[PDB]
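Researcher: Let's try something more involved. This one mixes different molecule types, so please make sure each is placed in the same coordinate frame as the others.
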Amino acid sequence: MEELEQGLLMQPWAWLQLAENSLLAKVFITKQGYALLVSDLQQVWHEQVDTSVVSQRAKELNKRLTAPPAAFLCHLDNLLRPLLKDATFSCDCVADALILRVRSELSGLPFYWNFHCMLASPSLVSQHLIRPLMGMSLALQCQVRELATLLHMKDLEIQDYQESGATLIRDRLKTEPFEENSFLEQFMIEKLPEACSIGDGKPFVMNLQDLYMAVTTQ
Amino acid sequence: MEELEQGLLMQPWAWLQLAENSLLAKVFITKQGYALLVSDLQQVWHEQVDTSVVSQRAKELNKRLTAPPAAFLCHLDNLLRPLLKEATFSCDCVADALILRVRSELSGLPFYWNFHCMLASPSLVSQHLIRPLMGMSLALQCQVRELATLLHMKDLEIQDYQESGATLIRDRLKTEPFEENSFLEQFMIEKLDGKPFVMNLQDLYMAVTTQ
Amino acid sequence: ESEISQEADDMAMEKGKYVGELRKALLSGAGPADVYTFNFSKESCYFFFEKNLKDVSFRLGSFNLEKVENPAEVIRELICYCLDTIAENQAKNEHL
Amino acid sequence: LFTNEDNPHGNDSAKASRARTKAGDLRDTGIFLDLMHLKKPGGFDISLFYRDIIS
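Model: All components are placed in one shared frame. Result:
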């Protein structure tokens, strides 16, 4: 309560090591456990179960729990590296039920364990999974616009330097001042097909993640 | 599969002028049923069902008044015409028994209407819409990098402007050598509800939502 | 007051506009551009009136009929009152 | 000296430099000058440039 979202949104946007898919999934190491949180505004598949219900489902519904939850907590706590040092997470995308079989393997014999994507908690998701839109707007879509304005005053300084002497001579630096409208129009008409850069999320791990943490800090 | 949602996504979002909340609703009612996509940012009404609910609403209150479905769809199309330049819905501050109240004085006798609402699904906010938002964020990052490179090359050209320049300088605007630490510090420390989101991104959202 | 709220709910309009429409339609005055189709269906023996616009059918009102037993007296009083008000208007006109 | 100009030095900076030099000269001589807001009294909006060496 008021600690899982605060202690979970801080997870850097790091790609989970799936064999095939390139989904955006983040989870942060929390002493109270873990809860895989995904945000895309259309349909949630988030693992979050009450302690009591999983308790009964382990006592008189699941007979495979041959390892105490203390072992799982210890494994969760003693995992400082986010990226694999070289436990590959394989998925079989053959049907609607995406059963991401998380093979719990520490060293040697792979322990048999599997996940299940049940319904998430209504209150927490409905209250804290709409914030990222406003958090992005208020911070990033103001900082970027202020950077653009700083460029605009730099262009103004260049142009009134030019009008007050220091006339440009060589053609190599002979460039027109930047215009946002003309740049947008030329992007739409000429370089939009060639600027489509998605791939596997190259900036997702080098620029998007850190700036998003800066966005999601507040 | 894709036709209806592809056509509806091109339709611009219609913010309802209620001055009490943020409403991000899509309306496009021309053919193939009615697309009354009412969403309060927490529960979208996937009201794409057939004439069953329309007929039950029109008949359970009107035992002597009937209108054809063609008239219903024409009225639905004409519903929000004088609003995109009233059809206002008012919520309340009461518990989970959400009963909307319409107390407009039109004939002296209050008019009674019920707003059917189902349970809000907590599995409705993590699949698609941020992926185009991530594309727009990538476009914004590319624009920021382009503007930063333009700033850098203009700074280099300004470095040419002191040996062939020496123009009128107020002496309070000297250009120090560019330092990444100072740039990041000034970008971070100093220049760091829902209504500002919509009234700041309604115009920008249509730019990249297509391609 | 049986069927009036639909004409304020369907096209979501408030009072005053309907009052103004009634005042400028029931009284004298008509528009040459806007044709009026006052279809009184005597052949079908069913009394109803319709106002057609933008090739769609809507509702305006309903008027059940109950036969009056003294039409001659009311019509004679009506024409007498019309003549009296003509005389009064002419007298005021000449005085003015 | 009273005027509505908080900084009348949008002209050539040579004039400003010469004025500063002469102000230093008269300060050395013992002359003191006074200026205060006239255009917008209050707000510390005056003496944008004169706040350097004039007090």
